[PDB]
Amino acid sequence: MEMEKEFEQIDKSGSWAAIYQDIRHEASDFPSRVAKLPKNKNRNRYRDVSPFDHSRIKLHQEDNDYINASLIKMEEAQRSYILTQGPLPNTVGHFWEMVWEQKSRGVVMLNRVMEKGSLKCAQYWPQKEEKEMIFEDTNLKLTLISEDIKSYYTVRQLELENLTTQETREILHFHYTTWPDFGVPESPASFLNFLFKVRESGSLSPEHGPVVVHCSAGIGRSGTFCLADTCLLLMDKRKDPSSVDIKKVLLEMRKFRMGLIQTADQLRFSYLAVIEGAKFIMGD
Numbered sequence: 001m002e003m004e005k006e007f008e009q010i011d012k013s014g015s016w017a018a019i020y021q022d023i024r025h026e027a028s029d030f031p032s033r034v035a036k037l038p039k040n041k042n043r044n045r046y047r048d049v050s051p052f053d054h055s056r057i058k059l060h061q062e063d064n065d066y067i068n069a070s071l072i073k074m075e076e077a078q079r080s081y082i083l084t085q086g087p088l089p090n091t092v093g094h095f096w097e098m099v100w101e102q103k104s105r106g107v108v109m110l111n112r113v114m115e116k117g118s119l120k121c122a123q124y125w126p127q128k129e130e131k132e133m134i135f136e137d138t139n140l141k142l143t144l145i146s147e148d149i150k151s152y153y154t155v156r157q158l159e160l161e162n163l164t165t166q167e168t169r170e171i172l173h174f175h176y177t178t179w180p181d182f183g184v185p186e187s188p189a190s191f192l193n194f195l196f197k198v199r200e201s202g203s204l205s206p207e208h209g210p211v212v213v214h215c216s217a218g219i220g221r222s223g224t225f226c227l228a229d230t231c232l233l234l235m236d237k238r239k240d241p242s243s244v245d246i247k248k249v250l251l252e253m254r255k256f257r258m259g260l261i262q263t264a265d266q267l268r269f270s271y272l273a274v275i276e277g278a279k280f281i282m283g284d
């Protein structure tokens, strides 16, 4: 069923809360035993948001390999993403270790460091060129190279050095600065404009490790970004673009990380973004 007609049918019947609960009911439940070990309590921002054991990212160290991050592999789509929480004061070094070990080119940040008067994530990147950051626990150095500030978002060029080997890589930081918490972007338009900038960068392409995507918990805004990207890619690839079922794509992605799309209003925006984006995919 053309998602645009499904959309108007749910909107006119006001049944978004009902569709959403149906997905919550059918979603996968897999064990998260490593996340719940006592030694890992301070590595989790939220008690009720954990990576599944089968899809968790492992840090390459014998001490403790745990980070709150999941590998989302989307089969038909040919795309991978790492979804993670906003780093904590004691996990900023683990975060950059993971970026290094997984060979990621991009980091996509969908939250502000402070929202609703509380800290939603650590200040994990340098704000000035001449004030670099050293992560002594993981032996990494991070330097700000350049910053391009727009109205809705900011792109930064960062240099990450492995202090052990003196190899360096360029990381691109894509920071959406205007998305409300348990809320939605105001127009599908600024969201999509941002998604197309990440794509243009090469950050989502198979020659790199998976893009790292986060918000505060790494399920809500993060889920919206990956869901919209994957649905638009499948519409590009298939003979019949109207065969893309957003609810079925969301359930496939929930096999890899719990709780993706955290409100009935976030799913609706997901639709709008895919539907408006199609206008591009189908040749405009």
Ligand SMILES: CCC(=O)NC(=S)N1CCCc2ccccc21
Pocket: 074, 075, 076, 077, 078, 230, 234, 248, 249, 252
């Ligand atoms: C376990 C892998 C798997 O079976 N994936 C399947 S069926 N689909 C079909 C529809 C939703 C979707 C979206 C992006 C990529 C793949 C898929």
